[PDB]
Amino acid sequence: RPDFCLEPPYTGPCKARIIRYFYNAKAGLCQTFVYGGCRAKRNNFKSAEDCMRTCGGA
């Protein structure tokens, strides 16, 4: 899994209400969060399946 999978979820400075997924490295799986709609960081996926495919590790 890429190192970016260990960053905490980043909502960003915008105030839209976009449900995304991030990988939670302590939990070992992806959880939802409200993305504000700008300035995303890489641990930010449109589905749990994409999030796990990228971060769920070897």
UniProtKB/Swiss-Prot annotation:
<keyword id="KW-1015">Disulfide bond</keyword>
<dbReference type="GO" id="GO:1900004">
    <property type="term" value="P:negative regulation of serine-type endopeptidase activity"/>
</dbReference>
<dbReference type="GO" id="GO:0070495">
    <property type="term" value="P:negative regulation of thrombin-activated receptor signaling pathway"/>
</dbReference>
<dbReference type="GO" id="GO:0002020">
    <property type="term" value="F:protease binding"/>
</dbReference>
<keyword id="KW-0964">Secreted</keyword>
<dbReference type="GO" id="GO:0090331">
    <property type="term" value="P:negative regulation of platelet aggregation"/>
</dbReference>
<feature type="disulfide bond">
    <location>
        <begin position="5"/>
        <end position="55"/>
    </location>
</feature>
<dbReference type="GO" id="GO:0005615">
    <property type="term" value="C:extracellular space"/>
</dbReference>
<protein>
    <recommendedName>
        <fullName>Pancreatic trypsin inhibitor</fullName>
    </recommendedName>
</protein>
<keyword id="KW-0732">Signal</keyword>
<keyword id="KW-0582">Pharmaceutical</keyword>
<dbReference type="GO" id="GO:0035375">
    <property type="term" value="F:zymogen binding"/>
</dbReference>
<dbReference type="GO" id="GO:0140678">
    <property type="term" value="F:molecular function inhibitor activity"/>
</dbReference>
<feature type="domain" description="BPTI/Kunitz inhibitor">
    <location>
        <begin position="5"/>
        <end position="55"/>
    </location>
</feature>
<dbReference type="GO" id="GO:0097180">
    <property type="term" value="C:serine protease inhibitor complex"/>
</dbReference>
<comment type="function">
    <text>Inhibits trypsin, kallikrein, chymotrypsin, and plasmin.</text>
</comment>
<dbReference type="GO" id="GO:0004867">
    <property type="term" value="F:serine-type endopeptidase inhibitor activity"/>
</dbReference>
<feature type="disulfide bond">
    <location>
        <begin position="14"/>
        <end position="38"/>
    </location>
</feature>
<dbReference type="GO" id="GO:0019870">
    <property type="term" value="F:potassium channel inhibitor activity"/>
</dbReference>
<dbReference type="GO" id="GO:0043199">
    <property type="term" value="F:sulfate binding"/>
</dbReference>
<feature type="disulfide bond">
    <location>
        <begin position="30"/>
        <end position="51"/>
    </location>
</feature>
<feature type="site" description="Reactive bond for trypsin">
    <location>
        <begin position="15"/>
        <end position="16"/>
    </location>
</feature>
<dbReference type="GO" id="GO:0032023">
    <property type="term" value="P:trypsinogen activation"/>
</dbReference>
<dbReference type="GO" id="GO:0005509">
    <property type="term" value="F:calcium ion binding"/>
</dbReference>
<keyword id="KW-0722">Serine protease inhibitor</keyword>
<keyword id="KW-0646">Protease inhibitor</keyword>
